[PDB]
Structures are given as C-alpha cells and as structure tokens.
C-alpha cells in the first residue's frame, strides 16, 4: 500500500515475477505429488457386507460408517497426533486439490481391492479369490509350501490379530 515505493520497485526489472512463478510451480508440484501417490485405482472397490475372511479381522483398518468422515480407527488415531493463516501481509495459503475425504476413499478402495482380489486388481480387472487361498499364494512366494498355512490357519489368524492390537496400542500410547 505505497504508490511511491511501488514505482521505485519497477526500476529493478522483473525480480517480482520470478518469485511468484517459482511459488506457483511449487504449488503445482505439491498437488501432483498427492495425485500420483494415492490415485492408482481406476475404480472404487468396496468390501462385501459379510466379513468371512478365514478368521482374519480387518475391522481396525476398514472404514467406520458411524464417524461423520469415512476414516478408519487407525486413521482417526493418526490424525489426532499431529498438531497445527494468521499473517496479514501479502501472505496466503491455498487449499489442497484433494480433501481428506477423497484421500480416505482412495485408501479404502486400495485396501478393499487388496483384501478381495489380491494383486490381480493392479494388472487388469479385479478377480475375486478367498483370502485363505490368497495367503497360500503369498506363502508360496517366499518358498514355503501352502500346506504349512492350511494346517495352521487359526494360529496365523490369531497372531495377525494380536499384532494389529499391539500396533493400535503403540499408536495410541506413544506420541
């Protein structure tokens, strides 16, 4: 707010446009990052109403319809652990292109495709497969026969549930 200063400023050439251009490029890059990291699914998959996953319990990571936002339990824990516009010079902040609900929907679609189809949804179209057989397919990947899994299924299910409980407690306790 000075007509005298803004006229002396024009004698310096174009130092005032390069900074704006650089900051605009930074903003575009920050949008592109979020676009390329999460948006990797063509469709929006969702889990079947009945959860028969061979004994595995994904209720801690699946979205919670009761909350106003469709975030999971662990996401709700995470969003409360990070703390922190008031300036009124030529300083402003812009809102991100994708709201938090859109990010939550992306991470829900990815997880609900992973549970039901496995890795077939990343190549072509999602192909359904029972989770107990998908885990055998994954065990064969690391050079362990599938009869090891099929004869111990309850043990692996219990260990996975206990590990999820431990990770939830660790996130809830330590800051």
């Amino acid at each position: 707010d000075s007509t005298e200063c803004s006229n002396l400023l024009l004698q310096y050439g174009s130092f005032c446009t390069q900074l704006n251009r650089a900051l605009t490029g930074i903003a575009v890059e920050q949008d592109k990052n979020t676009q390329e990291v999460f948006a990797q699914v063509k469709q929006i998959y969702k889990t079947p109403p009945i959860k028969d996953f061979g004994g595995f319990n994904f209720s801690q990571i699946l979205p919670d319809p009761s909350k106003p936002s469709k975030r999971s339990f662990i996401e709700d824990l995470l969003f409360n652990k990070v703390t922190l516009a008031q300036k009124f010079n030529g300083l402003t902040v812009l809102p991100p292109l994708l709201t938090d609900e859109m990010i939550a929907q992306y991470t829900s679609a990815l997880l609900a495709g992973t549970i039901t189809s496995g890795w077939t949804f990343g190549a072509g179209a999602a192909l359904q497969i029972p989770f107990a057989m998908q885990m055998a397919y994954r065990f064969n990947g690391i050079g362990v026969t599938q009869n090891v899994l099929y004869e111990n299924q309850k043990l692996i299910a219990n260990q996975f549930n206990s590990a999820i409980g431990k990770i939830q407690d660790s996130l809830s306790s330590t800051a």
Binding site: G13, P130, T145, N147, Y150, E151, Q153
Partner: protein, 198 residues
C-alpha cells in the same frame, strides 16, 4: 500433447535465458540503463557512482540465474538416473517389479530416442475375459489331503479340475498334479473327490 515433458524443459531454458537477457535494460536506480551513455555524459567521480549501482544489479541477476540453473540441473540428473535404471532393467531383461515397466505383466521394452529425452515402448500381458468357478483348498481321497503342485482346484458344477492360475486350461486331477500331506481333518473347507492314479 504426448510430449509435454520434453517441451517443458525447452520452454524453461528458453524463458530463463530470455529473462536474463532482458534484465540488461533496467536502471536499478541509475540515470540510464546503458553505461556507454553514462560514461559519455558525466565526470568519473559520479560516473562510477552510477556504474557500481549497475554492477550490483547485474551481479545479482547473474547469481539468481546460476542458482536456478543449479536446481534445475539437479532435477534433470534425478530424472536421468531413473531413465538409466529403466533402460538397465526393463530393456536388458524382464522385470518383476509391479508397475515399473508399464501396467500389467511386463514382457519386453524397446527404446527410442527423442530431443533431450528417451521414449520406451513397454509391451505387457493383460487378461481379458473372466469366468466363475468353485474352489477348494484340498481334496480327500482315502483320508489323505492332496494339494495342487502348482495351480488351483476348480469346478464347473459337477466335475473337479486343476488349472493354472493365469489362464483357464483344465486338466484331470491325478498324482502328477498334486502332493499329499497328512490326513484331512485339519483343513477348513476341504471337499473330497476321487483322484486318478495313472
């Protein structure tokens, strides 16, 4: 519009050079933007007072340009490293890394040159038409439990077959497709059917 990536680099370089050239016609507070006029219009004791002001302005312009060039060069090197990695892995071999050499199952790649860049033509395998079946983790035959050596057990409603996981090609279940492991009172979801012995 496919080659925006390579056009952006050229545009950025040209625009930076244009700005650097255009920075010469600025007073920076001096009487004139050309020092030849200053030297031919005033005595040295104030000619130098104008000259050093011009010097400071132009030196600041050069330093800004050099810093921007350094940052852009770092970014270009970061991209060239990825290009070299893709040439080493996608072209000179077959890559099992998912979504690294194109969407789908990677088969081969072919390199093509371009102005200030490279272009890859990834060839990929994609399944097309699907079906529905009814699987089972294993099969009891005589109290035993046969698991597939490689593949899945599928049924078309009445008969049970064993097929590979990526392409429908059913075959009769026999002792050359399955292996035995213990009894079958532990597996969950097992269904028992006859197993042929050659």
């Amino acid at each position: 519009s496919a080659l925006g990536k390579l056009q952006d680099v050229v545009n950025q370089n040209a625009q930076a050079l244009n700005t650097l050239v255009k920075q010469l016609s600025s007073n920076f507070g001096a009487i004139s933007s050309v020092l030849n006029d200053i030297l031919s219009r005033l005595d040295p004791p104030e000619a130098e007072v104008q000259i050093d002001r011009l010097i400071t302005g132009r030196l600041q312009s050069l330093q800004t340009y050099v810093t921007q060039q350094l940052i852009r060069a770092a970014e270009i090197r970061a991209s060239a490293n990825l290009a070299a990695t893709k040439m080493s892995e996608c072209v000179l071999g077959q890559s099992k890394r998912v979504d690294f050499c194109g969407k789908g199952y990677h088969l081969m790649s072919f390199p093509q040159s371009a102005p200030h860049g490279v272009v890859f033509l990834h060839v990929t395998y994609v399944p097309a038409q699907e079906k529905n079946f009814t699987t089972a983790p294993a099969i009891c035959h005589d109290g035993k439990a046969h698991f597939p050596r490689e593949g899945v057990f599928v049924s078309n409603g009445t008969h049970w077959f064993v097929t590979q996981r990526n392409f429908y090609e059913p075959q009769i279940i026999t002792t050359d497709n399955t292996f035995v492991s213990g009894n079958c009172d532990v597996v969950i979801g097992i269904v028992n059917n006859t197993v042929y012995d050659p």
